[PDB]
Amino acid sequence: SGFRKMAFPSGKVEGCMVQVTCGTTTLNGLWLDDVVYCPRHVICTSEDMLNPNYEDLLIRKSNHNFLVQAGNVQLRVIGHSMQNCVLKLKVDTANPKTPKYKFVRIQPGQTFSVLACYNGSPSGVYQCAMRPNFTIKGSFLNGSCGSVGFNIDYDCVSFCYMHHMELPTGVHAGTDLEGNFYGPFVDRQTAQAAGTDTTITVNVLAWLYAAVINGDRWFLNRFTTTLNDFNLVAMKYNYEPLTQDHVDILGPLSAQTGIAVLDMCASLKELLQNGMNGRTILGSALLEDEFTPFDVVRQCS
Amino acid sequence: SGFRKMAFPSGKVEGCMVQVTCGTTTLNGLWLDDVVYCPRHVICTSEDMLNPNYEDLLIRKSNHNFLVQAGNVQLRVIGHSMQNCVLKLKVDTANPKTPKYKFVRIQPGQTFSVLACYNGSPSGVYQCAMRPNFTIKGSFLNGSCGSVGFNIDYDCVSFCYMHHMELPTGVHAGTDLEGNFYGPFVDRQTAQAAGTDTTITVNVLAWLYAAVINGDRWFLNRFTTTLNDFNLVAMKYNYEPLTQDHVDILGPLSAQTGIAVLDMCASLKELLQNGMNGRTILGSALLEDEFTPFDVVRQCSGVTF
Ligand SMILES: CC(C)(C)c1ccc(N(C(=O)c2c[nH]cn2)[C@@H](C(=O)NC2CCCCC2)c2cccnc2)cc1
Ligand SMILES: CC(C)(C)c1ccc(N(C(=O)c2c[nH]cn2)[C@@H](C(=O)NC2CCCCC2)c2cccnc2)cc1
Ligand SMILES: [Cl-]
Numbered sequence: 001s002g003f004r005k006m007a008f009p010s011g012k013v014e015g016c017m018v019q020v021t022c023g024t025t026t027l028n029g030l031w032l033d034d035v036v037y038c039p040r041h042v043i044c045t046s047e048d049m050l051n052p053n054y055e056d057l058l059i060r061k062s063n064h065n066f067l068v069q070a071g072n073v074q075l076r077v078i079g080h081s082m083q084n085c086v087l088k089l090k091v092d093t094a095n096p097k098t099p100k101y102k103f104v105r106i107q108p109g110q111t112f113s114v115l116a117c118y119n120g121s122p123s124g125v126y127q128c129a130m131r132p133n134f135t136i137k138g139s140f141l142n143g144s145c146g147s148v149g150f151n152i153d154y155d156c157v158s159f160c161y162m163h164h165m166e167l168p169t170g171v172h173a174g175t176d177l178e179g180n181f182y183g184p185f186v187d188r189q190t191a192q193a194a195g196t197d198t199t200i201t202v203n204v205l206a207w208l209y210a211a212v213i214n215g216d217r218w219f220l221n222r223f224t225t226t227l228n229d230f231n232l233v234a235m236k237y238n239y240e241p242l243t244q245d246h247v248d249i250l251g252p253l254s255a256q257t258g259i260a261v262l263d264m265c266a267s268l269k270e271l272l273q274n275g276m277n278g279r280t281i282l283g284s285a286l287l288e289d290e291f292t293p294f295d296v297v298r299q300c301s
Numbered sequence: 302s303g304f305r306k307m308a309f310p311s312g313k314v315e316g317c318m319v320q321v322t323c324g325t326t327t328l329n330g331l332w333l334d335d336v337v338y339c340p341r342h343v344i345c346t347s348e349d350m351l352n353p354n355y356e357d358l359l360i361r362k363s364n365h366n367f368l369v370q371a372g373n374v375q376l377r378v379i380g381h382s383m384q385n386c387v388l389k390l391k392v393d394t395a396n397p398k399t400p401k402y403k404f405v406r407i408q409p410g411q412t413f414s415v416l417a418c419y420n421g422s423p424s425g426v427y428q429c430a431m432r433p434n435f436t437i438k439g440s441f442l443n444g445s446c447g448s449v450g451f452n453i454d455y456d457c458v459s460f461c462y463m464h465h466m467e468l469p470t471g472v473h474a475g476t477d478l479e480g481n482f483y484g485p486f487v488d489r490q491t492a493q494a495a496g497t498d499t500t501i502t503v504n505v506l507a508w509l510y511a512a513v514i515n516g517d518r519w520f521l522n523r524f525t526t527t528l529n530d531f532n533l534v535a536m537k538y539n540y541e542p543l544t545q546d547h548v549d550i551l552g553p554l555s556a557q558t559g560i561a562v563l564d565m566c567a568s569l570k571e572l573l574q575n576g577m578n579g580r581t582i583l584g585s586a587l588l589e590d591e592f593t594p595f596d597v598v599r600q601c602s603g604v605t606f
C-alpha cells in the first residue's frame with residue numbers, strides 16, 4: 001500500500017557520470033564504453049552565446065582542449081565528433097562500470113528518472129515527465145547540463161534525455177542521446193520560450209486507477225461519457241486529447257479495478273467541474289499527471 | 302530553478318541488498334562487511350505470527366535454516382543472532398561493495414531516502430519523512446520487508462530505517478538498524494494502529510522558503526509574530542510546536558531571503574487561518590511538510606556526494 005513519486009535506483013547511471021571541462025566551462029558527461037557524451041555547447045564561448053557555429057568552433061579544438069575527469073582519474077581524449085547537439089569524446093579507457101544500455105527517444109507524457117549532477121558528481125534523483133510542450137519541469141542549477149534521464153525496466157538502462165538548458169519560466173530543455181532536441185528548442189541564447197503547457201490526461205486517469213487500487217473510490221460517480229464528449233470538456237481545462245490508443249493502454253487497469261475507461265473519464269470530468277471539496281487523492285490536493293499507466297502497474301504490481 | 306521531491310543517489314545502498322529466505326518466507330537483507338541484517342520476523346511461521354516467542358524460535362533455528370542470495374551467488378551463513386527486532390546473519394564473505402557507513406537513529410520530522418526492494422533486487426527509490434506519529438507514508442508491497450532508508454553525507458551512508466510491516470491504514474512501521482522500533486509498534490500480528498498524526502511545522506516553513514527562492518511570493522505579508530502566539534495557532538491546527546531551535550535552524554534561509562522566521566511564521570499563521578484562496582505554492586495545493594531545512598538548502602545550492 002501507499003503511492004509515491006518513485007525513481008529508478010540510480011547506481012547504474014552514477015557509475016557513468018564524469019566531469020567535462022572546455023576552457024572556463026565545466027559540465028557533466030556520460031561515459032559509456034570508450035565514449036563520453038555531453039552537450040556540444042560545452043565549446044560555446046562566453047563572448048558569443050547568441051549565434052555559435054558549432055562546426056567552426058569544433059574544428060579548432062585539439063583533443064587536449066577537453067579535460068575529462070572520472071572521480072580522481074583524468075581520462076585521455078583521443079578523438080571527438082559531433083552528432084546533432086551532442087559531442088562524443090573518444091577516450092583511451094572504456095568505463096568498466098558501463099551497464100547494459102540503449103538509447104530511446106520518448107513521446108510526450110512519458111516519465112523517466114533524472115540523476116542531477118554537478119561537476120560530474122551526483123546530487124540527487126527525481127522523477128520527471130516529458131511535458132506536452134516538450135519541456136521538463138526539472139530541478140536543475142547552473143552547471144547541471146549533461147545530467148541524464150533514464151528508465152531501467154528489466155536491468156537495461158534506457159537513456160532518453162540529456163539536459164542542455166533552462167528556459168525563462170524555469171523549465172528545462174534537452175535532447176535524446178542522439179543529440180536531437182525535444183521540441184523546437186536550440187542550443188543557443190535566444191528569446192525561445194515554452195508554449196502553453198497542458199495536462200497529460202492519460203496519466204491523470206492512470207493515477208485515478210492507482211487511487212482505486214489503493215482503496216479510495218470517493219470521486220467515482222454513476223455516469224459514463226463518450227470519448228468525444230470527454231475531449232470536448234477536458235480541452236476546456238487545458239487537458240490533452242485522449243485518443244483511442246490511450247483508451248487501449250488503460251485496458252489492463254480498467255480490467256483490474258472493474259471500472260470502465262469511459263466511466264473513469266466521467267469521474268475526471270466531474271472532478272474538473274467540482275474540485276476536491278477539501279479532500280485528497282493519494283495525498284494530493286491536485287490531479288497528478290506524471291505517472292503513466294505503465295508506472296502505476298509497476299508500483300501497484 | 303525548479304523544486305522536486307529528491308532522493309539521495311542510491312548506488313552505494315544497491316550494492317548491499319541481498320535476498321533472505323527462511324522456510325517459505327522470503328524478504329530482503331542488508332549485507333555490510335560479513336553480516337546480513339534483516340527483520341527478525343523472517344523466522345515466524347503463520348502460526349507464530351499471532352504470539353511469537355522469538356527467543357524460542359531463534360534457539361530452534363540453525364545456520365542452515367537461512368538461505369542468503371547475493372544476486373545469483375549463495376552466501377554461506379556461519380552464525381546467527383538477534384539484536385532487538387533485527388536478525389544478524391554472519392556470512393563467510395565480507396561484502397566487497399560495503400560503503401563507508403554508520404547506523405543512525407532519526408527523530409520525527411527528519412527525512413530519508415528509501416530503496417524499495419523485492420527478492421533482494423532494488424526496485425525503486427523515494428523520499429519520505431519520519432512522521433510525528435512514527436510511521437512512514439511509504440510505498441511498499443508484500444515482500445518489501447528489509448528494504449532500508451538512508452541519508453548520505455559526503456561518502457558516508459547513514460542507515461536509519463529498516464522496513465518491517467504495514468499498518469491497517471496503509472502506512473508503514475519499522476526499526477533502526479539496531480532493531481529498535483520507531484513508534485509504539487511490535488513485530489507480530491495484533492491490533493496496532495497509527496496514532497493521530499500532526500504536521501511538521503519546521504519543514505513547512507522550510508518549504509515556504511524554497512517557494513520564495515523559486516519566485517512564489519503571494520503569501521508574504523507585512524506582519525510578524527511571536528513563538529507563543531504562533532504556537533497557540535499551531536496547536537489549534539494540529540501542527541507540531543515550533544521551538545527556538547527550529548528558528549535557529551532556519552536562520553540561514555531567513556537571512557538569505559530577507560524573511561525572518563517570525564515573519565515567515567506570520568505567513569504560515571495566515572495560511573492556516575484562511576487557506577490558500579485557490580492558489581498554489583510550488584505546484585502544490587497543500588502545505589508540504591516532508592522537506593527539512595537541510596533538504597531545501599542542499600537542493601537549492603546543488604550539494605553533491
Ligand atoms: C550556451 C548556452 C546554450 C546558451 C547555455 C548557457 C548556459 C547554460 N546553463 C548552464 O548552467 C551552463 C552552461 N554551461 C555550463 N553550465 C544554464 C542556462 O541554461 N541558462 C540560460 C539562461 C538564459 C539564456 C539561456 C541559458 C542553466 C541553468 C539552470 C539549469 N540548467 C542550465 C546552458 C546553455
Ligand atoms: C510476521 C508479521 C510481523 C506479522 C508480518 C507479516 C507480514 C508482513 N508483510 C510482508 O509482506 C512479509 C512478511 N514477510 C515477508 N513479507 C506485509 C505486512 O506487513 N502485512 C501486515 C498485514 C496485517 C497483519 C500482518 C502484517 C507487508 C505488506 C506490505 C508492505 N509491507 C509489509 C510483515 C510482517
Ligand atoms: Cl515513449
Ligand SMILES: [Cl-]
Pocket residue numbers: 353354355356
Ligand atoms: Cl518475543
Ligand code: NA
Pocket residue numbers: 521522523524525564565567568
Ligand atoms: Na509577514
